[PDB]
């Protein structure tokens, strides 16, 4: 169930993450905080046009090996 996924940042970098398909979005955001310093509640992860919800798993979204996600920060101020 182990796989690599790619997380593209707004600064033009790619983060390569080692994950499990059963990992929750919470778990992925914790890894991104460890690598980038961004608090998890400010992170937003996008896959195929959808923002991923904290308590769901990668497999819930059919995110498979070598998938690419996009990391943005939550929009503020409305």
């Amino acid at each position: 169930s182990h796989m690599q996924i790619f997380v593209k940042t707004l600064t033009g970098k790619t983060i390569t993450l080692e994950v499990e398909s059963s990992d929750t979005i919470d778990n992925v955001k914790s890894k991104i905080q460890d690598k980038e310093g961004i608090p998890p509640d400010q992170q937003r992860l996008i896959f195929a046009g959808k923002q991923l919800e904290d308590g769901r798993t990668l497999s819930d979204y059919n995110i498979q090996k070598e998938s690419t996600l996009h990391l943005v920060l939550r929009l503020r101020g409305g």
Binding site: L10, R44, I46, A48, G49, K50, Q51, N62, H70, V72, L73, R74, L75, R76, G77, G78
Partner: protein, 188 residues
């Protein structure tokens, strides 16, 4: 002979046409005018927008990227975060306020390192995540809240989404576009 803003726009256009954001297709409205882009947007699969074919225009100022563009849906989208005139409500489409008391970060306001790719990804986020505390469209925000609170039993908000998706079918057929309906088709 190209101005600085024309050169910046040419670079961004080339990047977004050769390495597109999935579900977004970018073209010039007029072949000779780099300052007005058409953006064709697919509703993503496994959402209520699936099958939709939406269009927006991005209009750029003479001094891009030192000033922000506008991003406006041509046919209107009923959404808490989209103004009724079609403008999307995003902080980055406005210059910084230079107020250390405001608590705003550089990444949240326009600056010359911001770009269209960042705008598009911000629009995806805005479409996913209504801000009901500070809505662009109060009536859509109130309706969205009732839909969310009733667990979909008050169907009005979803009925409007379905109606606005259906209204795009004629435009898709005119453009000869087949809207993706699966993850594999959307990510091509």
């Amino acid at each position: 002979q190209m101005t600085s803003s024309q050169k910046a726009l040419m670079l961004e256009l080339k990047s977004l046409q050769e390495e597109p954001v999935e579900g977004f297709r970018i073209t010039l409205v007029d072949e000779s005018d780099l300052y007005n882009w058409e953006v064709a947007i697919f509703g993503p699969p496994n959402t209520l927008y699936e099958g939709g074919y939406f269009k927006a225009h991005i209009k750029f100022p003479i001094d891009y990227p030192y000033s922000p563009p506008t991003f406006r849906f041509l046919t209107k989208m009923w959404h808490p975060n989209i103004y009724e005139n079609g403008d999307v409500k995003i902080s980055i489409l406005h210059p910084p306020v230079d107020d250390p008391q405001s608590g705003e970060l550089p990444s949240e306001r326009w600056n010359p390192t911001q770009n269209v790719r960042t705008i598009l990804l911000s629009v995806i986020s805005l479409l996913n995540e209504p801000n009901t505390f500070s809505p662009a469209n109060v009536d859509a925000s109130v309706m969205f809240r009732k839909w969310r609170d009733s667990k979909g039993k008050d169907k009005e908000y979803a009925e409007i989404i379905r109606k606005q998706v259906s209204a795009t079918k004629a435009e898709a057929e005119k453009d000869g576009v087949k809207v993706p309906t699966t993850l594999a088709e959307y990510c091509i």
